Amino acid sequence: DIEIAQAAKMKPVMELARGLGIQEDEVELYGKYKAKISLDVYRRLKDKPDGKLILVTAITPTPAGEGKTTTSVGLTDALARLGKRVMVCLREPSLGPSFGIKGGAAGGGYAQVVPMEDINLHFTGDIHAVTYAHNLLAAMVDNHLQQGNVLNIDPRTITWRRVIDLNDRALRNIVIGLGGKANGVPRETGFDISVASEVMACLCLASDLMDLKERFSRIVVGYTYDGKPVTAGDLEAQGSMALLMKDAIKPNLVQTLENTPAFIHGGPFANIAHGCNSIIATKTALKLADYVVTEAGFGADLGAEKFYDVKCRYAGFKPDATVIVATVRALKMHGGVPKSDLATENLEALREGFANLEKHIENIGKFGVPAVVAINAFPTDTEAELNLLYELCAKAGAEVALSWAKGGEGGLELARKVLQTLESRPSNFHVLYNLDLSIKDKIAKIATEIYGADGVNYTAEADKAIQRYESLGYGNLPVVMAKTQYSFSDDMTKLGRPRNFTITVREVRLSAGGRLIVPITGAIMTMPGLPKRPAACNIDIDADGVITG
Amino acid sequence: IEIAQAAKMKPVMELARGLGIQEDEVELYGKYKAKISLDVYRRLKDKPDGKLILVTAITPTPAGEGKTTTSVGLTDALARLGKRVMVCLREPSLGPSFGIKGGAAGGGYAQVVPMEDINLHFTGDIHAVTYAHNLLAAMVDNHLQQGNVLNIDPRTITWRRVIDLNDRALRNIVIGLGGKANGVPRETGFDISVASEVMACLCLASDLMDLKERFSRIVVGYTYDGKPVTAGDLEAQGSMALLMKDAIKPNLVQTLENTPAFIHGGPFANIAHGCNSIIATKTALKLADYVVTEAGFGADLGAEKFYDVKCRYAGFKPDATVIVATVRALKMHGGVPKSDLATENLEALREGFANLEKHIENIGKFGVPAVVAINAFPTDTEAELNLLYELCAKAGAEVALSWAKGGEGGLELARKVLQTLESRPSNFHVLYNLDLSIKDKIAKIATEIYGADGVNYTAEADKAIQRYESLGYGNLPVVMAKTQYSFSDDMTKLGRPRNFTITVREVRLSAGGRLIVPITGAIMTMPGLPKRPAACNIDIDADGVITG
Amino acid sequence: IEIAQAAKMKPVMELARGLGIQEDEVELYGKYKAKISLDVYRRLKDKPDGKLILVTAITPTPAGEGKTTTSVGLTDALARLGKRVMVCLREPSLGPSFGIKGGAAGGGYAQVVPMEDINLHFTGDIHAVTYAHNLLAAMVDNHLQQGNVLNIDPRTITWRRVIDLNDRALRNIVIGLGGKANGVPRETGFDISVASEVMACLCLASDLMDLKERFSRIVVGYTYDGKPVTAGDLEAQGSMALLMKDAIKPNLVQTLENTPAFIHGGPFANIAHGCNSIIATKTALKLADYVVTEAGFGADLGAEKFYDVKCRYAGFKPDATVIVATVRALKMHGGVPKSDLATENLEALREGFANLEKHIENIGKFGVPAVVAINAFPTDTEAELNLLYELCAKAGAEVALSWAKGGEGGLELARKVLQTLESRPSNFHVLYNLDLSIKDKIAKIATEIYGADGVNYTAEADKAIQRYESLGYGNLPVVMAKTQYSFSDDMTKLGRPRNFTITVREVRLSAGGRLIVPITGAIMTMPGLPKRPAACNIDIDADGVITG
């Protein structure tokens, strides 16, 4: 009854690709339950109309839990049960998370996309390419120095760090190229967890390969002893990198416990990147489906925001609705209640917590898309509580989801609301800001309309940095806030709806394979480490089965 | 261009059928590649095995080896006479592809396919390894950060990290910098993945459960008291194993001639036996009458190691064994320059021949047949041939033109291996004993095979050996980590060097197999791209690859 | 050239006589420099002390301070009227000499001599310090190598190494690399020697035995449990002391006007009180009627610190205190550019004046007289002067042209200090208490002296403070480690900045004295030569120096 203990009947993905309209020649199988669909499927369909895009998001996430994917999948399965033609697009998780704090499922309970074990491990080798397409470029840099450094790159300015898909601290700050004039040039760098590599970020925003390629040739690796930028393009590396991602460009097909087809592609950080799965998996999902559920990392002040301002902006998508997830316990948590006494009733801590969800509602409205809250059901939640949460939603259609437990069935109501609102309230989508605005301007719009922050404070580094980019020509790019997700403010302790506060960005990075990434707090946790109790320590694989994952 | 040679492949699932594999025992990675389960072997555990045409080669030279081509091209001929035989090769490190380009699996009309899927990601067998290693490293470094419960000395740590790219800048580095939250600063580096003890364990393991344990014994470092610490004491054994549940399965692909070819594993031939994985062949055996397998470097390194590492543990008995070699190759062994291979010379071709002749002899010593295999080249004229032809006066000697003729040019030799394997019944025996002495095992490997009048051990090579034997890692085999371009450690002594001597400077322990006794600086465990990389030149058309 | 100003010196041994020093209490370092023993003080322990014309200055600016010149030039005048007074300065770091050249001790005809022996090695007082520090570091690093018996965390080690040269490349490094015999790899760096907590201890110690113990309390780092470890737990206390047995003695030299001048010590004025050594003055006192001493930076930093660090422990009571300042200097404080000092402006000269006026006030707060000292410059015309003259409407205000007139231009002011020190009897009191709170001590130093409406402490500044007080290093004084170019942390706010606020980012503990509360990035504990160093240009003739 544990989530993985729920291993049962999948249909061969060819049957699936078939029973969806995908040609057999456009399916690169991996087992009988995995596939890399050609981008031709899309390409030849581009003229038909798009399906309905339903973005699922959630409330300020707290340690109490909410359940985003679980719903995302449940919502799907439900729409399917109600006869609707639909797919789901979700990200392939990072590997390290499996060996440090144990791997989880694509959602959970009866709400999840499978084969679980694969998606949670090597899945179809997507990440590996990213890891290598990345480390190769890293070596072309180190090589170029080692070769006479024609381009004249002042090594101490190299930003292109190296990467690996495991949680390893020590690799955060290391010195490279040691040993003598025959081992490269001495320097300072480190490793970032793969999923956080800009390369992955690009895969999640590219149109196809030739596009993804040009992007690569835009990646900044460092600067000359003169100040001018040097890109991977100058190291002529886009083709090679490109060749490594040749097979990672295609989305991957896999189903739900209930068989509904779904795409698992991309999957980047959601503070240093848009926390969304690739546009290709979705765009291909929009022709092959009449309904498309997809989700975004972190609460709606981030994932949602970037989903709307970066993904959709580039992809030309136009969300029709948007479900937002919230539990009672997490809410009460936002109302001040500790973790321990959460099970105890308290409409009061619940009422002031609502301010949280009630803010996201309002924000999601700041985009022109209709919102529907989903109350992830939980044993302790009382009627005196749920019932309040419902009427409290004096703004958007509410509905409890029992998808975790009852699979598709427990998700029937929500579908009926989503569907209901997918008819009477057509969406009027539109980016929160404009690309031809000041950089600090863009940041305020967000901190001001979304985080509900009074204003923005910046450090001397933060300024020179910005000032550089704008004159260096990247001012008109999209912005990607990298704040703490456990709060509407860059203060992880300020739960609920924090008022009269100010965001302080203290550093500003750049991702020319996309845009400007400004971090507020130490939101630079680009490489997590393992716990004193490495989940990998209680790991073991039977002479047959795998135990403890 | 040998790449242009991309035409007419077949469903592997079918081949898996036309070999006796239940459909439920093949994981497809496209329609032309497929992981085959271990369940096959296990059940056909008792079924009659097959022969073992272990192909090997002379002494590498800037002229042109021919080891692999010849190996598959013979299989393109062998079964091309209605025979039940396969292949068992190795995936070529990735890094080389964007550094010094890439090449087909073997050569000419005998190259296993598809080409690209190989030099590249393939069934991502390396990546699996890569992670099963780095992680270990990650757990070691993490331990320290935790409180170093095992009281390990970060400075004695022998477990480096791993990436599969030619990165020089990564051969010597310092990690852990940054303070109490970044862990413990210390010195390590990166070695190419294929060069991982892990890839090795892979190439020498019965099954996952074997591999799992075969992992636990590998020493990561020692404590302040000098007490060895193993992945075991760390609890990363099974963990690592699960990252490998998919690579432990042998891959499956064909030849241009659709001959069932297994391509599983890829270890460093000098620091390790340099042969393909066991399971692949131990399983390939059952599923066939014959099995054509090759090893790394020359016959003094790869062949010897195949005989004392692989066969040893896995219990094979190399019914046959061939030895490749070309004219121009053996000529150089006579003083013949690289810009002087174009011309004929029946005297240098002669002396140089001593190379081919020395190997021959060594082969026979393992209680297994031998046969000469000759590469065909546009300049190896008549006069030259009729000389080497008769010179091999010692055992079978057939010419093979598989390159430009496919399985055809291999027919001649084909018959020969059958013929000389039908009448010549061998009794395979290890050229040395696992109970001798690390010091004496090197002794008989240096003496009889290379030709060392003696072996010398520097102040280091000594201290270690002792520690190893004082610990217990002394009853293990020995992988001679010396320069491959001569029986002697001297990379300049071509031919059949005499009166020499081999000195062992260092000695690294691999508790995931045997003992690597390094000679000269054969520590190129991490190569490095050139000033004119194929990477800078590789591009993928809005359609397909161009220049890889 | 002020260097050319090298003419007519005298035997120090004689001066030591004409002051009341037994010949057996002077260690000569040439005929014109001499270490005087501590035995002098000790015996004249009860003898009547003297006055303390503590000279200080305005707020530094790219125009020209004048702190030291004025200080000695007043002594060239004071005793130039038959008076028993000396001096007490500091040796200028070596590194600057081959980087941005060197200068005389003070300026004009008031520079202590010989010049060269100072900017250079002198009586090698630094070197002594330099070694007494590095060694400690050497013992710390050695301990680790031994087995880290104290269970110290190499990563928590706060004790860097030390060299007295402007080396950038040495500000962040990793040592210990190389293996079990090279010790434990870790991250540290080098800070200039004069900037050493050691030089400091020196400048604030009763005698060697005091200094010795004053050493033992200095924390080098902590353990894995967070338990402080001190030089004491290391046993380097006395050791270090013996390296210092010779520097603990004050040096002795004269003025161009042979006025007995003590030049002992030289601490960083921002990270430390920036005043000369105690013993020098506590001893200089006895041996005189008066003693003219100065401190580092402005009066908000050096003066305040002199009053709460030095006087505190050593029990002085600054009978007087002067405050230097020039026209052009206070003009800039009115918006006056550097390329705009040449001209007159009685309005900017006015506002800017607020600087001079703010300081004045603060002075009085310590219960000690005050008096304006004005630098004389070729462009500080009549109109300009008569303005600043009367503007100082608050306490004594005399002009001094010591520069081009020697002890002469100091006469005017001379009389004044005597006059206003004869009729104005002060009751010296610390501007804050040692029993308050680190948080509240910063409070009253920020409020009253700088002018902070409040003080803010970042997440770090907080955690530390707490640890310090939770340990005990909380009952100590406070050395404000902030930018010296303004009462405010903002290096751009000239004049008398108001409404501001001071934020403390960091907080470093110096258990060899007090607490350094760093503000902006005032961590320039290791400067760096320019792209056009005086080193590249210094040459010593087959006779004497040229360009230093």
From Swiss-Prot, chain A:
Additional observations: Binding of monovalent cations contributes to thermal stability.
Superkingdom in the source lineage: Bacteria
Annotated organism of origin: Moorella thermoacetica
Residue numbers binding ATP: 62-69
Signal peptide as annotated in the record: none
PROSITE patterns on file: FTHFS_1 (PS00721), FTHFS_2 (PS00722)
Family according to the record: Belongs to the formate--tetrahydrofolate ligase family.
Pathway terms, separated by semicolons: One-carbon metabolism; tetrahydrofolate interconversion
Self-association state and partner proteins as the record states: Homotetramer.
Protein name, per record: Formate--tetrahydrofolate ligase
From Swiss-Prot, chains B, C:
Pathway where it operates: One-carbon metabolism; tetrahydrofolate interconversion
UniProt feature coiled coil, ranges: none
A Pfam family reported for this protein in Swiss-Prot or TrEMBL: FTHFS
Keyword Ligase: yes
Gene Ontology annotations of biological process type: tetrahydrofolate interconversion
Transmembrane segments: none
EC number of the protein: 6.3.4.3
Molecular function GO terms recorded: ATP binding; formate-tetrahydrofolate ligase activity
Group of enzyme by EC: ligase
Catalytic activity reported: (6S)-5,6,7,8-tetrahydrofolate + formate + ATP = (6R)-10-formyltetrahydrofolate + ADP + phosphate
UniProt record similarity statement: Belongs to the formate--tetrahydrofolate ligase family.
Subunit text: Homotetramer.
HAMAP family assigned: FTHFS (MF_01543)
Comment field (misc): Binding of monovalent cations contributes to thermal stability.
Protein name from the UniProt record: Formate--tetrahydrofolate ligase
Species per Swiss-Prot/TrEMBL record: Moorella thermoacetica (Clostridium thermoaceticum)
Native organism taxonomy: Bacteria, Bacillati, Bacillota, Clostridia, Moorellales
